[PDB]
């Protein structure tokens, strides 16, 4: 029965039981957890328990601002740079899967509905030193699959209808709230299927669950010297509803595209040994020596 | 206008701050909330679900063999079968449990634990075990007459596939803390041991070795404080295809 | 939005400012308050507890010998036994007292002091002392007939192990201040002297030299203003193992 | 009381009598899609007893070195009976499931079956960066076998899979598991040929063991779709 819980439950005092009838012995096979109370197992005292439960609220457990993107690029003249390089601008398809602390926390659930509070920290380093330029950056939110700019002075940066944020390095970090955007009532943290009508689509990736694109340029023309500009994107989920909890990820993540697994070479978190080994089942690992 | 002055902490980005921020999409109407089964509002709901202990965290126990304890017929009395270390903040048989993994996002914890053991021999397999919780202080008890002086349940698994050993919250402090020190008086919960109370006694056509699956959950007096990064996941590189998000 | 302007003092960190600041841990529930004995809400509670004066702050008085004044039988009358300097903001017999150490976190002070002297001879030891407080102005009185013109108590320590000399707050100003000038009219409290009112008169099997332990407390008219760093502790290095906090 | 159980849906009936008190997933019973959650505006077909009935799959041989078995829903049923025909003739699908997993043996046999219904069991592959293909995931009525059931083939854990709707078949206690699944999707309905809402996983946590006469012990899966809706009628795909 659903109830409001702000503190952990009190313990009632209990006495000696010696009864022939009603049971510390439950039924595992029903899939139910043991409802055996400590009052029924040992002889207890009354404890008025004032321990709050608010820090394990799913809103508090997930509304931590976590690093989701970290991109360095050269801020310089890119007349003669490679066609792979971020030429004063990068684009980033927003995902929660590239950094494993946020990834494992969000993958504790099957479905998540949250607004995405996006914080953008920019740091700059000179590639001799003459000082750091207070550069203006543009972060433009582009939807999944939509047109992203192809150069720094692209006419896609005009943002007639795309939301752009302009921000300076000397400023506080740029901060935007992206709404809950999904075409569904929740994001699918795990998607058991293909999101395409042919059989060649990607498994596990529903583009409904992709927030969108951060297209981040430097608005400034290049300086006579080069700079390395590191953009860090932080996401805080908020107004979070979470559904269907899952086993946590035990093995190391291999990719962001899937739930592929290798494990570590030895215990802990190996394919065939998640917990580190002890010598025997009757060996106590941190036995007090007296 | 308004005379103001900036405080210390102006312009900082605390990752745990709690502020309204600018809507990137004005007048966006989010998709209507649909009822989805299994909503979690508080992580203590997950932590109260019993999940398999990896008591057989030994070498040669490979994969799924680690989630059961094989008990055999013995020819000496009062014999120790297995023991379980009890610090849920540490690595051990409790770590990859629902109570263990959520607790290791936290530092401080209070509250009783329940241990449920399911006997998985045959119907014809009979026997009695004693499951002892020893509050901390000294070494782990190795004989039965030493361990039954603590909290224990005696379990006939004749018709009864399961019992619960409540590990009651017996601590000096309101919380126990992780500090990477297993032997600390602020950390150590004590011990769970299992002994042959009688003997595993099977007939000739039952398998002579039987298995126990152990579970652990938290009770509803359980609490977790001081949220920290989990030591259970980590990276020293970028993952595969993470660069493809920039392309 | 709101038209604002920054005042002088914007962005400053005053170490005595009083502002709310960002919670590092949201929804942290602190451990429930338990009743602990001996709660102090105001440092004047400590300052009213009598504590030993180090009146015997001389050389050859080693350690614990400094916390008692040995009185002996004398063969001249009206004789001076000891005197006490009275500025609680300075170093002297009052400094390492509960009233002295807390006051030296402050600059300004008002209020009466009490001096309690415990006679620690034998039961058979008899005698009368006169404990004189002299308000400031001139030199410390050296004869008894000069010192008894000020505030005094005459104490027979025959059956009476203790008396109190109230040093009443007699000042021109509301407060007395420390300025590192002992002879200042804003600082100097005057003098406490002790004289043989009769004589320490012991029998042959009592110890012929007897000790006095002197105490000082503040009364409840006592006040302390203008909080400053204490001159009683200091460092010119980092302490041992302080580097280990960075490792 | 907990052992006796009678399951009548349509023309199908199941009497299990060594059961262990059936699991309703997240305390939720299957319902039809209400009008305040509905999206597709055409009138759905609700075939009732033509589809809301037990579909028995092929039995699997519980053997000594078995790792586990999985079936994905609705994919295990998308080609069976009038459920499969309504799946193949409609774009949209919504139903709950009543899963009844059957495995008995003697009173001399030992063995525990974790019978667990996993929502959105996005399978990972082992020792590669390539995602699993269509043929690895969409097995249909035959189902698949767990590669590494200890991490549930997704890098997580068998040990914490009791967070999902599950029962056990401990051969001491019971011979049947019964899980009642509601609709479990972020969307109201779904295209049933490219998405699986539930994966029934059946895993040997304790292996089959006996010292009596060795018989083939099978695990039989009977799945009843519950409260079937089908929108977007067209030709058969």
């Amino acid at each position: 029965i659903e109830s409001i819980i702000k503190t952990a439950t009190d313990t009632v005092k209990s006495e000696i039981n010696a009864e022939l009838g009603v049971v510390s012995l439950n039924a595992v096979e029903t899939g139910a957890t043991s409802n055996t109370e400590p009052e029924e197992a040992i002889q207890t005292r009354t404890v008025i328990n004032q321990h709050g439960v608010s820090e394990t609220l799913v809103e508090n457990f997930l509304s931590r601002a976590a690093l989701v993107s970290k991109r360095s690029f050269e801020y310089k003249d890119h007349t003669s740079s490679a066609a792979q390089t971020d030429k004063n601008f990068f684009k980033w398809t927003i995902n929660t899967r590239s950094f494993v602390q946020l990834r494992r926390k969000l993958e504790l659930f099957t479905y998540l509905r949250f607004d995405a509070e996006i914080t953008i920290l920019t740091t700059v380093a000179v590639n001799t030193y003459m000082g750091l330029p207070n550069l203006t950056l543009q972060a433009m939110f582009v939807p999944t699959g939509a047109l992203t700019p192809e150069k720094q002075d692209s006419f896609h940066w005009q943002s007639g209808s795309n939301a752009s944020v302009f921000f300076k390095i000397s400023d506080p970090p740029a901060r935007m709230t992206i709404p809950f955007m999904c075409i569904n009532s929740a994001y699918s943290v795990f998607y058991d299927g293909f999101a395409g009508f042919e059989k060649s689509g990607l498994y596990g990736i529903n583009p409904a669950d992709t927030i969108g694109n951060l297209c981040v340029r430097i608005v400034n023309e290049h300086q006579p010297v080069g700079f390395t500009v590191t953009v860090r994107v932080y996401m805080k989920p908020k107004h979070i509803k979470a559904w269907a909890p899952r086993p946590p990820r035990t093995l190391p993540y291999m990719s962001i595209a899937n739930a592929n697994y290798k494990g570590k070479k030895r215990a802990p978190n190996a394919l065939n040994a998640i917990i580190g080994n002890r010598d025997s089942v009757k060996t106590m690992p941190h036995n007090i020596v007296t | 206008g308004v005379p103001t002055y900036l405080l210390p902490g102006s312009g900082q980005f605390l990752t745990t701050d709690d502020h309204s921020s600018a809507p990137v999409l004005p007048c966006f109407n989010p998709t209507p909330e649909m009822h989805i089964p299994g909503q979690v509002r508080n992580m203590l709901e997950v932590v109260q679900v019993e999940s398999m202990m990896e008591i057989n965290n030994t070498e040669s126990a490979v994969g799924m063999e680690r989630l059961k304890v094989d008990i055999s017929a013995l020819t000496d009395v009062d014999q120790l079968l297995f023991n379980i270390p009890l610090d849920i903040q540490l690595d051990g048989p409790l770590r990859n449990t629902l109570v263990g993994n959520i607790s290791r996002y936290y530092t401080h914890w209070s509250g009783s634990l329940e241990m449920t053991f399911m006997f998985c021999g045959s119907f014809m397999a009979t026997g009695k075990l004693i499951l002892c919780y020893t509050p901390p202080g000294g070494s782990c008890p190795t004989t039965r007459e030493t361990a039954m002086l603590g909290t224990h349940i005696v379990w006939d698994f004749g018709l009864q596939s399961s019992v619960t050993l409540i590990i009651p919250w017996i601590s000096g402090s309101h919380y126990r803390m992780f500090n990477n020190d297993a032997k600390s008086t602020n950390a150590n919960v004590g011990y769970v041991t299992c002994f042959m109370q009688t003997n595993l006694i099977v007939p000739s056509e039952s398998s002579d070795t039987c298995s126990l699956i152990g579970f652990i959950a938290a009770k509803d007096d359980f609490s977790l404080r001081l949220m920290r990064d989990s030591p259970d996941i980590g990276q020293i590189d970028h993952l595969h295809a993470a660069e493809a998000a920039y392309q | 939005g709101v038209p604002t302007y920054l005042l002088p003092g914007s962005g400053q960190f005053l170490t005595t400012d009083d502002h709310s600041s960002a919670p590092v841990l949201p929804c942290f529930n602190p451990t429930p308050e338990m009743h602990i004995p001996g709660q102090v809400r105001n440092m004047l509670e400590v300052v009213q507890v009598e504590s030993m004066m180090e009146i015997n702050n001389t050389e050859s008085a080693v350690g614990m010998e400094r916390l008692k004044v040995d009185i002996s039988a004398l063969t001249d009358v009206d004789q001076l036994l000891f005197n006490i300097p009275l500025d609680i903001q300075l170093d002297g017999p009052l400094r390492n007292t509960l009233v002295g150490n807390i006051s030296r976190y402050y600059t300004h002070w008002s209020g009466s002091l009490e001096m309690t002297f415990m006679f620690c001879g034998s039961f058979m030891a008899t005698g009368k002392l006169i404990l004189c407080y002299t308000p400031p102005g001139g030199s410390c009185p050296t004869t008894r007939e000069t010192a008894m013109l000020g505030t005094h108590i005459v104490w027979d320590f025959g059956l009476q192990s203790s008396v109190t000399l109230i040093i009443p707050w007699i000042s021109g100003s509301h407060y007395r201040m420390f300025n590192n000038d002992a002879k200042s009219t804003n600082a100097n409290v005057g003098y406490v002297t002790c004289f043989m009112q009769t004589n320490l008169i012991v029998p042959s099997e009592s110890s012929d030299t007897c000790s006095l332990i002197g105490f000082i407390a503040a009364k409840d008219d006592f006040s302390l203003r203008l909080m400053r760093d204490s001159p009683d502790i200091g460092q010119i290095d980092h302490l041992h193992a302080a580097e280990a906090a960075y490792q | 009381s907990d052992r006796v159980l009678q399951l009548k849906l349509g023309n199908s009936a199941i009497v299990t009598q060594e059961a262990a008190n059936y699991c309703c997933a997240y305390g939720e019973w299957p319902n039809y899609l209400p009008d305040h959650e509905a999206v597709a505006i055409d009138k759905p077909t609700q075939p009732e007893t033509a589809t809301d009935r037990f579909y028995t799959l092929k039995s699997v041989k519980w053997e000594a070195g078995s790792t586990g078995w999985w079936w994905k829903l609705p994919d295990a049923l998308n080609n069976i009976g009038m459920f499969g025909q309504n799946v193949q003739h409609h774009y949209l699908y919504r139903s709950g499931f009543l899963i009844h997993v059957q495995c008995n043996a003697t009173r001399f046999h030992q063995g525990a079956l974790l019978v667990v219904a996993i929502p959105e069991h996005q399978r990972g592959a082992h020792n590669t960066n390539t995602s699993p293909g269509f043929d690895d995931i969409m097995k249909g009525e035959e189902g698949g076998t767990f590669n590494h059931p200890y991490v549930l083939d997704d890098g997580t854990s068998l040990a914490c899979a009791t967070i999902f709707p599950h029962q056990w078949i401990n051969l001491r206690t019971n011979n049947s598991a019964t899980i009642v699944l509601p609709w479990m999707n972020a969307a109201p309905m779904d295209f049933p040929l490219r998405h699986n809402q539930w994966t029934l996983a059946i895993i040997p946590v304790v292996p089959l063991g006996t010292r009596t006469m060795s018989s083939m012990v099978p695990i039989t899966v009977s799945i009843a779709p519950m409260c079937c809706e089908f929108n977007g009628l067209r030709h058969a795909i």
Binding site: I1, E2, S3, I4, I5, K6, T30, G31, A32, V53, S54, L57, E59, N60, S63, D115, T177, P179, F180, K236, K238, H239, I240, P245 | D18, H19, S20, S21, A22, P23, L25, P26, C27, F28, P37, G38, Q39, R41, N42, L44, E45, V46, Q48, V49, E50, A217, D220 | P26 | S1, D2, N21, Y22, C23, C24, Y26, G27, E28, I163, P165, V180
Partner: peptide, 30 residues
């Protein structure tokens, strides 16, 4: 405090203390 016109813009809602752990601990029918 929220001076934005969208309700999703607001700060986090750390106020929902309703629990129903029995949908995970007792998902049984009898």
């Amino acid at each position: 405090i929220n001076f934005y016109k969208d309700s999703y813009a607001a700060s986090a809602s750390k106020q929902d203390f309703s629990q129903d752990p029995s949908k995970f601990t007792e998902p049984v029918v009898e």
